[PDB]
Write a protein that binds this DNA or RNA. Structure first.
Length: 123
RNA sequence: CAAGGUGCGGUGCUAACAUCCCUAGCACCC
């Protein structure tokens, strides 16, 4: 049983992706921000490419949880942080599995591959 | 029934003991 937590922070200026293993930082990247609806933010969390909206001047956080066994792969998105009491805004379970962390991690990063290409780095 | 988050620069002392991770107070150093 492998698990990765990804926290996505949306502002109009930047969208930040923070990946964690055992809750500690392993990978981060950020891209230029754009205007989004609530629906649009969920689609970004999903790794889709939504239509842009007017700016909102808002800051919001979304919590994406990836887990896998040799039998199944789970993908869950929360508005804000996971809580015992909170319903996910999107939840997917698929009959694919992984038996090494490196391959699991490669699958996880595949969700946002196209956003990774847009990342901003130092020179 | 919606309702925790600066997700973290070191060090020392005292107190306490959130099913990803994260105890509090004071002080010194950076």
């Amino acid at each position: 049983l492998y698990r990765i937590d990804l926290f996505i922070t949306f502002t109009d200026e930047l969208i930040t992706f923070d990946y964690k293993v055992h809750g500690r930082p392993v990978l981060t990247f950020r891209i230029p921000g754009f205007g989004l609806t609530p629906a649009g933010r969920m689609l970004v969390c999903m790794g889709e490419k939504p239509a842009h909206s007017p700016f909102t001047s808002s800051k919001s956080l979304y919590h994406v949880i990836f887990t896998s066994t040799c039998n199944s792969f789970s993908f869950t998105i929360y508005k804000g942080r996971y809580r015992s009491w909170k319903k996910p805004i999107h939840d997917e379970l698929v009959d694919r599995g992984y038996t090494t962390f490196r391959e699991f991690f490669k699958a996880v990063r595949g969700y946002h591959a196209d956003y990774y290409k847009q990342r901003l780095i130092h020179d």
